[PDB]
Amino acid sequence: MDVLYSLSKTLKDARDKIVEGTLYSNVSDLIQQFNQMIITMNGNEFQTGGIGNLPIRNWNFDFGLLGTTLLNLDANYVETARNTIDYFVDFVDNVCMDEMVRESQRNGIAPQSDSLRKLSGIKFKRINFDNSS
Amino acid sequence: ESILKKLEDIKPEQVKKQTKLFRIFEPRQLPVYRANGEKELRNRWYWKLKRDTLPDGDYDVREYFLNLYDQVLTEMPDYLLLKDMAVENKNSRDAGKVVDSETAAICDAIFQDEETEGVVRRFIAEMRQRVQADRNVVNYPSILHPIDHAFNEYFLQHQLVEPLNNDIIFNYIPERIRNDVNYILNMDRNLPSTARYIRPNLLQDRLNLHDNFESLWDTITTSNYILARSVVPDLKELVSTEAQIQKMSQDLQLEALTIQSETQFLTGINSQAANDCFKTLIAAMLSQRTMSLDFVTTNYMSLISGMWLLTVVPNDMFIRESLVACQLAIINTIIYPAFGMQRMHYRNGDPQTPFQIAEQQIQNFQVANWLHFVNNNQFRQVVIDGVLNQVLNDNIRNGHVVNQLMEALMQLSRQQFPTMPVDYKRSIQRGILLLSNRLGQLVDLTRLLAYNYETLMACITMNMQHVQTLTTEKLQLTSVTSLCMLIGNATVIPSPQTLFHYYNVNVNFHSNYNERINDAVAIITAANRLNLYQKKMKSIVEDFLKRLQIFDISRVPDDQMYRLRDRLRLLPVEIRRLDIFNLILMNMEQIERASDKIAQGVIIAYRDMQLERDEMYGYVNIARNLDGFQQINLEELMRTGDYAQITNMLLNNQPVALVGALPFITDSSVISLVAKLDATVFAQIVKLRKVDTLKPILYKINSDSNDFYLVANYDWVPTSTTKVYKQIPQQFDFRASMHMLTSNLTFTVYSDLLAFVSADTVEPINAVAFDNMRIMNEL
Amino acid sequence: GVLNQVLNDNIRNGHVVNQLMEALMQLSRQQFPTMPVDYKRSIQRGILLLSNRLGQLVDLTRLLAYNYETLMACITMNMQHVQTLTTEKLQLTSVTSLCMLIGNATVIPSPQTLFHYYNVNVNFHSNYNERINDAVAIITAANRLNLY
Amino acid sequence: LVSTEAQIQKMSQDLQLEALTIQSETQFLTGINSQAANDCFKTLIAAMLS
C-alpha cells in the first residue's frame, strides 16, 4: 500500500512538476525519485486480474530513465516524460481498481490483488517516499 | 613496456590430451591358500594399487587424497580420441585393438598364464573394437578397475570440445563489429563437420575485484589501460605543426615588446602531444582508469581546451581535485570576468563543483545550459552482448555538444568584461577564436573519439566497472590543445586486425582469470570437505595471483590473500571439477583400504579370537569391522596429546579399538603368534605417550610359514588377542573388468577461430558512425 | 583467593572486533561534508586498511586475551588497579605495526615459561610475606622489650 | 608476521601520502615494523598483567 501510494505520488508529482520551461532544479529530486521508480519497476511483469468484468491486463516495464541534461525542460522532454507517465498511471489505476474490487474475511487489511501483493516485496521498498496524505 | 608484454603473452589455454587411461589399480598375481592354510597350486589375480604410497595418519591420508584430486584434475583431458590409445591385441581372433597399452599387457599376461581358464581366453579372443564411421564413433575394449572405469568414463563423457563450423567462427566475432558497416569480413575455407573448438569461459567477475580490492583493481585497470593504448589507432594527416603555429601567431597578433598571455597559448602544440591525448582519452575510457588533469592556470588556451574536454568526457573520469581545479580556473578566468561577476571564492571540499555553483549563478542561457550539461554529463551503464559497458551520451557521439559549447563560447565572446582591462577581454577573445576557427574539426574530433571508443569497447569481454582508481593517468591540457589544433579531416578507425587482436587478448585474459578462479575454488572446497584444518590456504591464493600473471605477489599482503580466499570460498565449484571430487570422495575409503602399507586400525581385545581364513592370507588376524569395540580416534589423540584415556584403558586391559591409518608389521611366524607378540606392542604408548610409533602385528599364517606343521599336526585353528582392522583385496574378474570405451573416431580441434576470418575496412573517407553519417565531414 | 582483573567475554572471543569493523566500515562510507576530497580519500582508505584485516584483528584479539589469561593464572598477589605515578609510554605506531603485521601464527606461553613465571611470582610473594613477618617481629620485640 | 615490505607498500599505495600536502610525509609510516609489533604485544600484555 505504501509502495502503491508512492508510485501514485511520484506520478502525480511528475504530472504537476514536469512542465515545459521549468528549471531542472525544480524537478531534480523529483526526477531522481522517478528514475528510482523506473529502475525498481523495470524487468518486472505484473498482472491485474479478471474479477468481474475487469479485463485481465499484463504490464511490462522496460522504460529508460528520464534525462538530466536540460537546464530548463523543453517540449521533447515533457513529451517523453508524458509517455512514460501515461503508461505508469494506467498501471497504477488498474492496480488500484483490482485491489478495490476484492475483499477478504480473514485478513482484509492485507493486499488481496496479486499485483499489490507483489509490490509488498522488499525489492520495491526503494520506490517508497513521502507519505503525506 | 613490460606490462604490455605480460598481458599479451597470456596464451589462450593449454589443451590437455589423454595418452593413457587413468589407473589407480592393476591386477597382480598372488598365491592362494586353502581353508587349512595349505598353498594351492593355482594363483589368483587381485586388484592392487599401482602406486601404493599412502601415508600414516588419517590427516595425512586426507592430504594424500587432496593431492590425488589435484593429480586427477591435471590428468583430466579437454578431449579424447581412443584410436590414439589403441594397441594391437595379439590374442584377438580378428586381430583387433584395445585401449590402452596397459590393457594389452593385462590381456597378454592373463592369456599366456597356464592357470587361466579357457573361458577367459575365449573372452580375450572376442575383444575387438567396433567402428561406426557413419556416426563417427569407435568402441574399444578396455580392462579397468571400477573406480578407474568411473574416472575414465567421466573423462570420455564430459569433454570440452564442441562442433565447429563457419557460422560459429563468424559469430565468434563481437556482434557490434559484425553490425558495423565500416568493416567487411570474409572467409576462404569451409570447416568440415569433424572440426572442433573449445569455448572460452567468459564468466563475468565472480570475485568483484572492483569492490574493495583497490590495489588489485588498480593493477587490473593499469593493464587494461596499457592494452587500450596499444590498440588505439594513430592519428594520420595531422595539420602541420609549423603551419598551425604560424596561423595561431597571425590570429593572436603576437607582439615582441609586450608581455602577453596569448604567447603561452602556443605552449606544447605538437603532433606527439595530440596523439598522446587521443590515446590517453580513449584508453582511459576503455579501461575506466581515472585521469588527472595537468595544466598551468596562466595558459588560457589550456582552459578553453579543458572546456571542450569537460564537454566531451564525462567528469567522473577525472579525479575530483583536478576537475575542481580546472573548473575553478575556467570559471574565474573566462566566465565570471566575462559577465562581470565577482571572482568565485570556492572552498576546498565543497560538495558542489565550481561549475554547479556557476550554473546556479550564471544568468546567460547558453553558458548556463552548457554548464548544466557538463555538470550532468555521465556515462550510461548498459549491458550490451552480455558485457557491462559505459556508453557516451548520443549528443557526444554525434558531436552536437560541440555546437552547444560553441554557443556558450560565442556568448562569452560577446560580453564586455566590465571590470577587466580591454586587453584581458582581447586575450580571452583570442583564445575563443583559436578554438572556434576549428568548429567543424572539433565536431569531427568528437565523433571520431566516440566512434573509436565504442568500436574498441565492442572488443571488451569483462564488465566495464566505473569506480575511481587508486592511481590516475596524467593528461596534460596542452595535449588536449594540440589535439584540438592539429586534428585534420583524416578519419582513423581501428583496423580489423587490431580489433581482433584486442578482442583475443581480452578473451585470453578473461578465460585465464576464470580458469584460475575455478582451480582455486576447487582446491579450497576440496580442502574444506577433506577437513584439512592444519592447512593454511595462503599458498593456494598466492598461486592463483601468480597465475593471473599481472600482479606482483611480493606486493600483496596476506590479509588481502585471505580476503580473496573468503570470496573464493563462496563460489560454487565448476561442474567437471565438482563431479571429479565427488567421485574421489565416494571412492577414497575404498582406495585407502586397498593399500598394503597401512591398516585402518587395531583392535586390542583380551580374549582369544580365531584368525580369519582368507585365500590370499591363509590364517590372518584381520578385522573386517570394529563392531562391539569402543573406539579411540588416533588423530584426535595426536592432536590433543591427552593420553589419560588410552593409558587407563591399556593399564586396565579394557578392550578397545585404536582407529586411524597405521603401519603394521607382517609376521608369518607361528611361534611368534603362540608367543603372543602382537599383544606386546602397546606398552610403548603408556611409556612414551606417543602413537605415531605404533605398529601393530599382522599375522600371516600359512604353509609358507617355517613352523606351519604345528597348525597341520594338531588340528589347531590359530587364535590371537589383537586384530588388525584391515580389508582383504578384491579379486580380479577379467570378464567383469571389460568395458567398451566409446569415443569419436576422429576430429580436428582449432584454437584461433579468427585466423579463419580475413577482415578489411572501407575507405576511411566513407566511414560512417551510428547515425549513418560520415565520422569526419570537413573538407 | 587472588583478585584478578578480567576482560569482557567479547574481548576474549574477539567478537567485538566485528563491531569495531562495522563502525569503521560506516566511517568509510561517510561523506566528510567539508573535508578536502584527497585527504578524505586518504582517511577512508586508511580506515579500510584497518577494516579489511577483520580476521587478523579478531585472531590478534583472541591471542592477546588468551595470553593475558594464561599468564594471569600465574599471578599470586591481588591485581590491584591503581593509577601509577609514572606510566609506560605506548606508541600508537607500535599499535599500527601490531595491527597491520599480525599473521595467523598462534603463540602461547610455553609450559616452562608459565612455570617459571609462577615460580618467580610465588618467590616474590613468599619473600614479601616473610620479610613482613621479620619486620613485624623485630618491631614488636623492640616495643615489648622497651627499647625506646 | 606479515612481510614488512609488502604491508608498507600496501599502506603507502592506499594512503597516497606523497600526493597530499602533509608536512610530515616520511614520518607517517615510520615505526611500522616487526620489532614495533612485538614491542606492542609485550607492552600491552605486560601492562595489563602488572
Q: Which residues of C touch B212 (CB under 8 A)?
A: 48, 52
Is A70 near chain B, with CB under 8 Å? yes
Peptide bond between residue B100 and the one before it cis (omega within 30 degrees of 0): yes
**Contact (Cβ atoms closer than 8 angstroms) between residue C43 and residue C91:** no
Is B656 in a helix, a strand, or coil? Answer: strand
Q: Are strands B656-663 and B631-633 parallel, antiparallel or unpaired?
A: parallel
Q: Which residues of B touch C106 (CB under 8 A)?
A: none
**Contact (Cβ atoms closer than 8 angstroms) between residue C23 and residue C81:** no
Is D12 near chain C, with CB under 8 Å? no
Entry resolution (Å): 2.7
Q: A71–B365: do the CB atoms touch at under 8 Å? A: yes
Residue B67: closest CA among B47, B50, B53: B53
Residue B778 burial class via C-beta count within 10 angstroms: exposed 0-12, middle 13-18, buried 19 and up: middle
CA distance D50 to D46: 6
Q: What is the helix (H) or strand (E) element at residue B604, kind and residue range?
A: strand B598-610
D33 φ, ψ to 5°?
Answer: -160, 170
Q: What's the Cα-to-Cα distance from B82 to each of B132, B137, B138, B740, rounded to whole Å?
A: 13, 10, 8, 11
Q: What is the helix (H) or strand (E) element at residue B409, kind and residue range?
A: helix B400-413
The residue in chain A having the minimum alpha-carbon distance to the alpha carbon of residue B380 is A65
CA distance B281 to B480: 9
- The crossing angle, in degrees rounded to 10, of helices B146-157 and B575-593 is 170
**Contact (Cβ atoms closer than 8 angstroms) between residue B292 and residue B326:** no
Is B547 in a helix, a strand, or coil? Answer: helix
Q: Are strands B697-701 and B719-725 parallel, antiparallel or unpaired?
A: unpaired
Structure determination technique employed: cryo-EM
| DSSP letters spanning B328-392 | HHHIIIIIHHHHTPPPP-PPTT-SS-HHHHHHHH---HHHHHHHHHHHH---EEEEETTEEEEEP
CA distance A3 to A36: 12
Q: Which of residues 333-372 of B touch A (CB under 8 A)?
A: 359-360, 365, 368-369, 372
Q: Which of residues 13-52 of C touch D (CB under 8 A)?
A: 38-39, 41-42, 45-46, 48-49
b (16+ CB within 10 A) / e for B639-652: eeeebeebeebbee
Is B211 near chain C, with CB under 8 Å? no
CA distance C53 to chain B (A): 6
Is D2 near chain B, with CB under 8 Å? yes
CB neighbours of B152 closer than 8 A, spacing ≥ 6? B21, B22, B142, B144, B741
Is B97 in a helix, a strand, or coil? Answer: strand
Is C101 near chain D, with CB under 8 Å? yes
CA distance C98 to chain B (A): 13
With vertex at residue B275, the alpha carbon angle to CA B272 and CA B281, rounded to the nearest 5 degrees, is 135
Q: What is the helix (H) or strand (E) element at residue B600, kind and residue range?
A: strand B598-610
Is B474 in a helix, a strand, or coil? Answer: strand
Residue B378: closest CA among B403, B395, B361, B359: B395
Instruction: Find where cell 576464470 sits.
Output: B514
CA distance B87 to B776: 66
- Indicate the residue of D2, D6, D16 with minimum beta-carbon distance to B555: D6
C75 φ, ψ to 5°?
Answer: -90, 135
CA distance B550 to B516: 13
Q: For residue B135, what is its C-alpha cell?
A: 556416426
Residue B10: closest CA among B458, B499, B504: B504
Q: What is the helix (H) or strand (E) element at residue B196, kind and residue range?
A: strand B195-198
Tell me, yes or no, whether chains D and C touch by having 3 or more C-beta pairs under 8 A.
yes
CB neighbours of A108 closer than 8 A, spacing ≥ 6? none
Start-to-end Cα distance in chain D: 26
Q: What's the Cα-to-Cα distance from A120 to each of A47, A105, A114, A123, B474, rounded to whole Å?
A: 15, 20, 10, 8, 49
Q: For residue B601, what is its C-alpha cell?
A: 586400525
Q: What is the helix (H) or strand (E) element at residue B184, kind and residue range?
A: strand B183-186
Residue B245: closest CA among B268, B277, B274: B268
Residue B767: closest CA among B500, B503, B495: B495
B433: Cα separation from own chain's centroid? 53
- Residues linked to residue A58 through DSSP beta bridges, in sequence order: A47
Residue A57: closest CA among A44, A45, A74: A45
Residue B482: closest CA among B300, B280, B274: B274
CA distance B620 to B673: 11
CA distance B131 to B115: 33
CB neighbours of B2 closer than 8 A, spacing ≥ 6? none
Is B437 near chain A, with CB under 8 Å? no
